[PDB]
């Protein structure tokens, strides 16, 4: 028999025995193992159904948009700005928060995908002749210097990783091993980070990836461009332990766990069905 | 560093056009928002008006608009922030800041005053 | 509405103490500019992007603030810290910022 394949259901009969599949006690903490070959009489049925998309790994494995940044090529105010940074963290998107927040530790390499799209800024006229753009992103690893202006000395990335890309073509990408000081990447932490229970209680404390930093490379447009690039993330070689209850309440910030009081289910009229 | 100072004007006979004068040469050109800060005795902190070289898109603050031109010439690399049709409050201490991330290349700032 | 600035207006503050910054703002922020105006020459910038740094300031400043309330809070007062500190916001009509928040040395 193949792993990842579901159990088959025997033949029974009747019976009529001092046996009791049915009763049970659920006070033990112990979930009940009755199949359908206890409380009736079923048919042999060969079952060929496979578990192969509830695993972990196709669970987590599709790329999700984790953050959106903005830069354009002519500074208006901050922001937006020639330049944008982004702290790296995977709580500021609803949809892949919440996928991972069914486990409490886990464990993955990463693989990251840039698209970054460009559309040209209002103005009173737009006809110019524009060389292709090309963009850069640098990871700042914690603690490094990191860019003060445009033109800066930081960009010429001696030792910190950086990707450049001219617009057009396929959509950058690069793989991220697992980079915690821990042994699992902590998804909820219930603690401070000073000895004295102050300072910022939850996950923030543990959290320190790293910024990304974004540009353009070119000098200058004749007339303003904005920019967006979207950050792609999509978890590999995945474990995961210790399985949490779902996230019911919609979120309210990027580093709190906090909630606004909600029912815990949709209401209906009356406890009975009521028809023939 | 960022060279020099900003210049002073005094009190001018009636109608004319008034011109401050920045010296702001520390560059770095040129491609950059030349801020103007305003400030009165109260110690209050606004802004005048700002303007970009490489396509000349001036802006303003709606006390000192209806006029107050502020034109790019980088061959002298000055910054003007007076304004016309003005009256007699805008007796202030003016700057004339470079721009970086926050407002790091701030000016000296020359009081002038006006009335007759 | 809508006028912002800085919540106290004179303060004192002795060299040995905590200074603890609140002001307010007319319009929400991402970022947060905080400054410090002694009297006799134009003021100096003194924190960027909320925490980042500056030229001359000292590892004892730190500061904070989002959306309509800042913090610049000095975790020890010496005896060059008597200056006025005013916000910075970029707008998209900027609120404008407060006129400085006055402290002076005591004894």
């Known amino acids: 028999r193949a792993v990842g394949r579901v159990a088959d259901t025997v033949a029974s009969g009747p019976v009529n025995t001092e046996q009791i599949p049915a009763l049970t006690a659920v006070e033990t903490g112990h979930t009940s193992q009755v199949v359908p070959s206890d409380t009736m009489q079923t048919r042999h049925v060969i079952n060929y159904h496979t578990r192969s998309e509830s695993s972990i790994e196709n669970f987590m494995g599709r790329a999700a948009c984790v953050y959106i940044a903005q830069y354009a090529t002519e500074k208006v105010n901050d922001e937006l700005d020639r330049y944008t940074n982004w702290e790296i963290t995977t709580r500021q998107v609803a949809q892949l928060r919440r996928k991972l927040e069914m486990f409490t530790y886990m464990r993955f390499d990463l693989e990251i995908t840039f698209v970054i799209t460009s559309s040209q800024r209002t103005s009173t006229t737009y006809a110019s002749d524009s060389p292709p753009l090309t963009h850069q992103v640098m990871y700042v690893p914690p603690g490094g210097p990191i860019p003060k202006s445009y033109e800066d000395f930081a960009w010429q990335t001696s030792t910190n990783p950086s990707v450049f890309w001219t617009e057009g073509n396929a959509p950058p990408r690069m793989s991220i091993p697992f980079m915690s000081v821990g042994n699992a990447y902590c998804n909820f932490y219930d603690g401070w980070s000073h000895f004295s229970q102050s300072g910022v209680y939850g996950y923030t404390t543990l959290n320190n990836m790293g910024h990304l930093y974004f540009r353009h490379v070119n000098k200058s447009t004749a007339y303003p461009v904005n920019s967006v690039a979207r950050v792609y993330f999509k978890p590999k070689h995945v474990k995961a332990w210790v399985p949490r209850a779902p996230r019911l309440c919609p979120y309210l910030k990027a580093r709190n766990v906090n909630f606004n009081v909600q029912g815990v289910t949709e209401s209906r009229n009356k406890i009975t069905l009521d028809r023939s | 560093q960022v060279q020099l100072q900003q210049s002073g004007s005094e009190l001018v006979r009636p109608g004319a056009s008034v011109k401050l004068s920045c010296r702001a040469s520390?560059?770095?050109?040129?491609?950059?928002?030349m801020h103007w800060v305003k400030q009165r005795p109260g110690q209050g902190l606004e802004w005048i008006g700002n303007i970009y070289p490489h396509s000349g898109n001036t802006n303003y603050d709606e006390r000192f608009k209806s006029k107050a031109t502020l034109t790019v010439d980088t061959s002298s690399s000055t910054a003007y922030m007076q304004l016309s049709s003005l009256t007699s409050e805008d007796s202030a201490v003016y700057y004339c800041t470079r721009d970086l991330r926050g407002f790091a290349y701030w000016g000296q700032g020359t009081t002038v005053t006006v009335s007759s | 509405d809508i006028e912002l600035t800085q919540s106290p207006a004179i303060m004192s503050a002795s060299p040995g103490e905590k200074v603890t910054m609140t002001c307010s703002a007319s319009s929400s922020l991402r970022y947060m500019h905080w400054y410090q105006q002694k009297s006799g020459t134009s003021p100096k910038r003194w924190i960027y992007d909320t925490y980042n740094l500056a030229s001359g300031v000292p590892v004892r400043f730190s500061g904070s603030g989002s959306g309509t309330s800042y913090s610049l809070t000095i975790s020890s007062m010496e005896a060059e810290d008597a200056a006025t500190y005013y916000c910075?916001?970029?707008?998209?009509?900027?609120?404008?910022f407060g006129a400085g928040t006055k402290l002076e040395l005591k004894r």
């Open positions: 910075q916001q970029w707008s998209s009509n900027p609120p404008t």
């Open positions: 520390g560059y770095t050109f040129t491609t950059y928002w």
